[PDB]
Symmetry: T
Subunit: 160 residues, 12 copies
């Protein structure tokens, strides 16, 4: 009686611009995870262990995040690209340096990397929100989680 009578009800399709905006988030989340592991392995020095552990927590969050974004793309029939060549070619994050790095350096480097990742999400936010408020909520989760990680990591170098 209130039942719709069409047999093919279509779902919400993301525009290609929307898809491209999420793609920007995706490559930076993947880059951050790869850099996070690099730092996790190669960090040395005063308070090694805390940083080693916190960096894995960052990587866990970024990996869950990239999965969330890529699957949101798929849900809206966009198609993610998380391949190494694409990530390296299109990430906005400054390159992580080679070799062992002191804990103090890793703190500063990773804080910058996180901040760059958050900047990407904040940059695409309003365009994403305008087309799909539900996706913007996922972006909010990422902003909150990553900014927490930035605070947890950077506080090591804070002098008061």
């Amino acid at each position: 009686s209130a039942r719709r009578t069409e047999s093919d009800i279509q779902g919400f399709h993301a525009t290609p611009e929307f898809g491209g905006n999420l793609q920007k988030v995706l490559v930076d989340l993947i880059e951050l995870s790869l850099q996070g592991k690099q730092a996790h392995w190669n960090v040395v020095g005063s308070n090694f262990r805390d940083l080693h552990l916190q960096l894995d927590e960052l990587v866990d969050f970024a990996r869950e995040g990239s999965d969330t974004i890529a699957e949101r793309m798929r849900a809206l029939d966009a198609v993610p690209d998380g391949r190494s060549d694409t990530v390296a070619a299109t990430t906005t994050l400054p390159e992580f340096p080679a070799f062992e790095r002191s804990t103090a350096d890793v703190v500063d480097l990773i804080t910058t990397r996180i901040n760059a990742t958050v900047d990407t999400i904040r940059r695409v936010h309003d365009a994403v929100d305008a087309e799909d408020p539900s996706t913007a909520d996922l972006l909010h989760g990422l902003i909150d989680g990553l900014e927490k990680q930035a605070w947890l990591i950077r506080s090591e170098n804070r002098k008061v």
Copy 2:
């Protein structure tokens, strides 16, 4: 010194009748989706039976958690949900699920359509809900995200090349 309020009776946020009706719309479609999800779960047969059988239960779990969330949000805001079978049948916007066994391919299309319809209800009421109460719109976002994920996980069986 003190910023303490003096009132002994402080009231909670009360939903408008329109707001209540909008959440009721979401509720009946979520319950209907749960019932149809179980029907499909029992009655699907054919190529890749098991995957769909399993995925349908995850859909049902999500839709059930969703309807409890919406109904309780109604209660929180002094609205009164109606999830009785007669009301659900008489007021759901979902096309009826067909009777008896259905092929995996058919169940995929059928259930995808019914998730799409459920999501459409939530998207239709979204702006009016968000305008009155942003906190409730957030619950709607969770439902939209979770259901559209289910739709992707189910529908992809039938997507070719």
Copy 3:
């Protein structure tokens, strides 16, 4: 040597009468679950919380039950119908009333609803047992579980 040599050994098929008997159980278990949730949301008053919680436990049991019955039907190649229209059209349970209801009223209403559900199972029991003793065991589980729920709920209103 004791191995059977037929390549197609058929399983036990339920008669359509058997299927129909389980269908009767199924719609009442589903109706009970829907009514149980209605009560769980709309119950108000003295000892709200206990009833709110106990009603969810009832719903959990009834939902597990309806799954058990519908899957037993499928196991024996019967075909369940748990659709809203069928449930509303064929349930034997008295309708649950609209609106907020006091805990005392909900206690009496739900006890009656449970008792109606058990009555259906007891009514079909002997016919089910005659064709398939293994299914009757599932009915026994339902009778025991539901009658426990009736006692747990009704005891609230018992005056001694």
Copy 4:
């Protein structure tokens, strides 16, 4: 005052030789089903491999718990189970599982047939078991229910339309 019994030696329920033999029949078919279930689990290939691979392990787990239940029920009732490979091979009623790889479609039919055969043994001994010991028949009901569920979950892959 006191209803206490005075006997220092109170005996337990002892199964008849016929009862023991009937449970032995159930036992060998359950073990054989477990062995064939694993064979199929390793050797299935083709369309929807993974689902069947996984479902077969659940079948094996159930059949294994079942054979331990039956064997221990025998022990409880002063009967002596024989689950040795030679006895199982020489006395099982199940058709032999074929050797080497088998297609998903073939494994579905083959295993469904072997579950049906296992259940048939339990159904054949049921009335004689129930007559002597209703508590043991209840264990049989659990096996019948659990195995017929497995048969449905496996066979539905091959059921069309």
Copy 5:
């Protein structure tokens, strides 16, 4: 619609005889639990640890059993009596001795008392089944579990 009319649908209630039969099972399960704990504490000698542990498993099973029976009585409008005076005065189990007892003696004593408990259940079974098959299924679980315990305990003393 097939909806029933009644507002006060009543549940199945047990006969006095039925309640009395469940009461008999109840006192013997409670007695067995108390005797099980006595044995658990006071057993000494060869293979103490195994028997000490197994006896706790027996107790767990008997306590779950007593609760099951007593709650089934409640569901069916019967009233259990599990009080110490009642258990002592009405149990059919041979008295368990005081003081330390050898493992071999404990095996024999507890096996006898388990068998006594199973005997009570087997004695009331047919009258219980005839009135309410659902309750008889609970009895079957008890017979099965306790007879398993008898086997696990008595096997210690078996020769060849």
Copy 6:
């Protein structure tokens, strides 16, 4: 490559007004937690157990909430103050009474104080959302959870 150049990419920092708004939410969440525990310990009378338990769930939620807000302040370079003197001097919640209180009185008192807490969050919401939508999502979780608690608590005193 799309890689950014900067070596010291900074994170989003909150305005003084924003930090002040989160501080307001923080003191009321801490106050509510302290009042929740007071009520939890000192409630007596009809349906004591339900209220005793529910109040602990309220406290759990409020404590998780306070930590969330305070850590969001830290992430955004604001500085929380959750000290007892500050909470007492700046909380907007009506004072909770000392001494034993009836269940009915506790229901009314705590419902009022939950509502006061939600009011603070709702009052700052638009200013918070305008500056940082990601933080507003945290506020939504709080509004949703606390308003759920108000419903679960107040329903005890509802008549018909």
Copy 7:
């Protein structure tokens, strides 16, 4: 071997007959409380049934753990517990629990009284127990604390302020 004792047989701390007697007093009242708690758990009816039904089981769990603790502490100290039904009935200090269904109000009063009697036993033996073995007194403190908490959680139902 600088500080090593060279004794082949080093004996354990042994409880006096008085100490054993004192723990036996605690043991029977803990067992009686457990049995009465279950009686109440089953037969309680009326306003706030569920809360009381549930709390009474928590009481029983605690009293059962307590009795096992005391009995095994006796065993550790070469004393011999007697937790048999006849002994418990003949020697408990707890007032008898009445038969039949009892209202929640009545059960609250009854059970509070019986908990308080149990705590009184432990409090009565405490100083003698502490004088001989402080480690056992600590076990009593656990019991006192746990049981008085139970009494508060149960009795608060009947409080009018």
Copy 8:
């Protein structure tokens, strides 16, 4: 009914006003410590931030469990706790925690001092509490042991050897 008491009303152990006062002293300092611990948890910055951030939460968890333990022990003994913000601020013996971000070195020293003040309160009331109720003294021992462990785990950061 051989040893059974026949009293209808058996009353529980009641704390004296002095005893209630003594537990109240412990309660406010435990609550103040929890609030200061969280303040420190949030605002600590600098070398070894994470270890301290994490340890401070463990301190808070312990102090929160402790305050609930003491308050409910008061309830059990018919005393009435007051854990309200005004009462805690007006009656705590703990030195005030400073505002703003503080270095890890400073936080270590500050928090060690505040833990030590809390332990001092418990140590000050211990003998009076033990004299009236040994079971409550045991709860104090738990608190002393747990808090002094926290002090060691925190202060060791600033140790130079």
Copy 9:
């Protein structure tokens, strides 16, 4: 740039001789599991319970082992045969005797059965290692686990 350009890269194929060597391990692991259960059911006498329990742990290990070996065969495109007829026809283990057996006898019998199973693994070891060192590691796990079980079981009969 270092990327291989072939679209079909083949994996490592086991030789049929390798497959046959693992098949030898497989049938003995299955036979051991079947014999282990036989012993687990039929063991009686002094220290029954310990043996009953330890025998199930042996069976668990042997079942996990046979799954590991059969799946390693499949991974390398060999094809296992764990059918009852094949196991009975090709196992190297001495037959387990019928009927109840004393704990002392079961200890000696099962120790021999385990030792025979380990001997098979040790016999094929060097041929397996020569073709695939990764498979030999799985054999090492089996040798270590089974030899542990032999020690745990046999120690019961050791007189010193």
Copy 10:
């Protein structure tokens, strides 16, 4: 009396540059496999979508645990891993995963090929690794076993008859 060593500085095992390079080779292929595994996980569509979607995540989990193991083994032995995106892309031996959606059948072949390639790298460096450090070769064996199992579980979808 004493077998104690006297050195205050005892060095750990240090890998040769060649050993480090060999583990680096394994590392980049494991990371590349993880990235391609996720790509396939998101982008697979068609017959038996769900099974492959799920199995691919298990592959990714294994490859991720593997790369952390190898990288940390490098660190343990004074070698320095490079898992950055540029290095992985520039030095992986895996054929590139294609862009956009791919059918289940194609994903099966593609991913199987890429696992085979990853395993080939480990098998190629194996003997040189084992010669210098047998303990590291054991870690390689785990990877070989786990990946070849994944290859079987994925590839069997496409294997016929």
Copy 11:
């Protein structure tokens, strides 16, 4: 700041050298017991091997937790534990455990004796420990209770009644 102390540095409770010495005595015997327990765990042979093998590990678990508890209690009170092998061997009061395989009967007697020696140490220092710090005496009570339980569970094997 009404009741707030204004001291910048509030120091913790410090153990006397006698108290530290007393805990050190308990510590070495707990460590020795753990090492002897493992020796017995490994080398026990004969009738009822498994029960003893398993019980001995539970003993070791308890003794290891106990030693950590005592050592960290020392740390909390500004005392310094020494749990090094040389110190333990030179200062333990436990009779030496013999080398080689030992029968279950012998192990029961040996280990009971060694547990009893350990408990004796704790019992010997108890009053001095309690006099200075009642909170530490409670930790001793835990140890006494736990170890005497272990002695009962082990020694009961060799009892003939």
Copy 12:
């Protein structure tokens, strides 16, 4: 049938030299565990908490290791000696100092003693592998785990 004839199939037994080699590993693992606990309790100073925690993880690993080796000895008919006098008299580890020690000193000391322990295992490895490859796999696990611990501990003191 391929069934073997023997009734008393014996297991692999280790040479005196092999048992002696495992004994060497055993005493150094026990010593390391005792030294690990000493360090765990007595470390003070900068980054205390991290080192305190990590040292417990080292101890856990070494204790699991000692049990593994001692039980492998038992499986192979060797007899472990883990007694305090034997460990003290035969351990190759440099003595750990008494008294409080700084974090930096503890890092250096424990790293040296871990390396000493790994050295023992590496010294006996080839003789162990030649006799029994299955035991050498257990040695590999130990080398891998301990060398991981050395890295996690020593990195604290690494400069740049």
